[PDB]
Amino acid sequence: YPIINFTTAGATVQSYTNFIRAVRGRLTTGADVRHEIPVLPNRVGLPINQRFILVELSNHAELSVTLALDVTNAYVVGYRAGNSAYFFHPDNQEDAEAITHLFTDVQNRYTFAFGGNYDRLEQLAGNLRENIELGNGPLEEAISALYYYSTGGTQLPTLARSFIICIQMISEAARFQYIEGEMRTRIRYNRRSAPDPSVITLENSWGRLSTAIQESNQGAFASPIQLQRRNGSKFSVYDVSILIPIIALMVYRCAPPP
Template sequence: MTLVYCIHSFRKHREVIFHTIFFSQLFLLFVSLFALNMILSFSTKNATPETYRDFIQALRDQLTAGRPTSHGIPVLPRREDVPDAQRFLLVDLTNSQGNTIRLAIDVVNAYVVGYAANGRAYLLQENARDNRPPIHTLFHDATTRIDLGFDGSYSGLSRAAREAVERNTPRNRARNRAGASAHDNTPVLEQIPMGRNELDTAISLLHSASSPTNQALGFIVIIQMLSEAARFRAIEGLVRTTMRETYDPLMRGLAMESLETHWSDLSEQIQRAQQRNETGFNRTIVLHNVGNERREVNSVDSPFVRGVAMLLYDRNGNCNPASGPHRHDEL
């Protein structure tokens, strides 16, 4: 009698556990699909540090909904696990003149792949040639699709934006104290100011699409103020201070550069440390703080790691084929 009861009890509990796991996974899938079917929006008109903070958090929430974590940080999905119909998050950006562009952000890596405005779709070249994102699923209501002559890497964007940056440099130097130190040999990215007004202008540059060099400049501003801010709380904090009525535009310094160019490295080391049930890294990552001081990051206990809001899936560490070069963290 006792044996029969135990068997019956085991079967009953097994069914409860199975249904609990099944419905938990179903709920997470529902949350993910619901989030990715929403269109986020942000307007520079009357923008404040608080509205920007809430927008970036909403962007993070949609990118990471239902995702597993590594040392408490959400890990973005493998491309194989995302249906084409759910591959991109759409974001509407509107400026003070009422011009709106619709950005497409890849949920696998938070990269901007293109945008639509005025019935036209503009798509960045893909620099990971073997693993192109399914951009054919985007912007079906656009009457014209234009493939831009540059990719989304910072090196590609910098080359394309150089003419526009050189044209705007005297004005930026006059307005921004940080920009006043720029000289002819200053890298293009370090000559591009960011802030509320600069985002407003970037939206106009993409909306009007007057020239490829202006579009590249607009992409650089928007990518850093959206994608990079979503990845890193420190970058969000720097940008947030420029959402006031009066502010000094933000210029890309060593602190921002070191984070932007080491996101994939940080993602890799954090995930591999968890796989070993450890906190230490296999190799040191060199970053810089806001005072431009060199800092070595060797552990998930570093304050730099606590400022990472999402991780790129570590394909190599999970025994998958290499994913090819990354876009925005490639210089």
């Protein structure tokens, strides 16, 4: 599978931007774009040899871990660190079979008894996304935590928090230019901070926004979607137009209308 590399060592806004652009390029094919927004490959009929992409992360501590992402939804399905690989609990038989095609050369394969969804990860981490700092520092530390898990150097709560960090800085950033922007700001000023309401609400609404845009009538939503500003105030989205500068990738829901 295609591999994209990124290192927190000496990371800059430009290196991070190039990385995210590369991830998006491997996630989508360019065959599906609606209202100027690219759509991820339809899972139905997708050959297994095109199902995943690998993101190899390295840090200043000279440690590396490789995340495996599902191209149909940008979900992080597992990772490899040295001679060991860990996968989140598959949601169905199709997915369980699919992951057997990842990291086939690793000596030790493990499948977590829990899923990789935020609700579960936050529960294990003992903290909600709104209380977990993001930035280059948190990412560098998350890479180390993931790397030392197999040897008992990392506790479950810390492992869960580390996944939460990686998922947002890689997958959510790939999904939303807005979130990518927020991560760029953190890198530019070397600051770590938890995601504000605008970030959390976008992450939580990705599925709904994808469906709303795809089922829209010429771009107009049948029912408005509520999002939050940075200060937590609510505002409604009635059209795809206002989201073009915000969302970079959508999960496939249905075929586009004629």
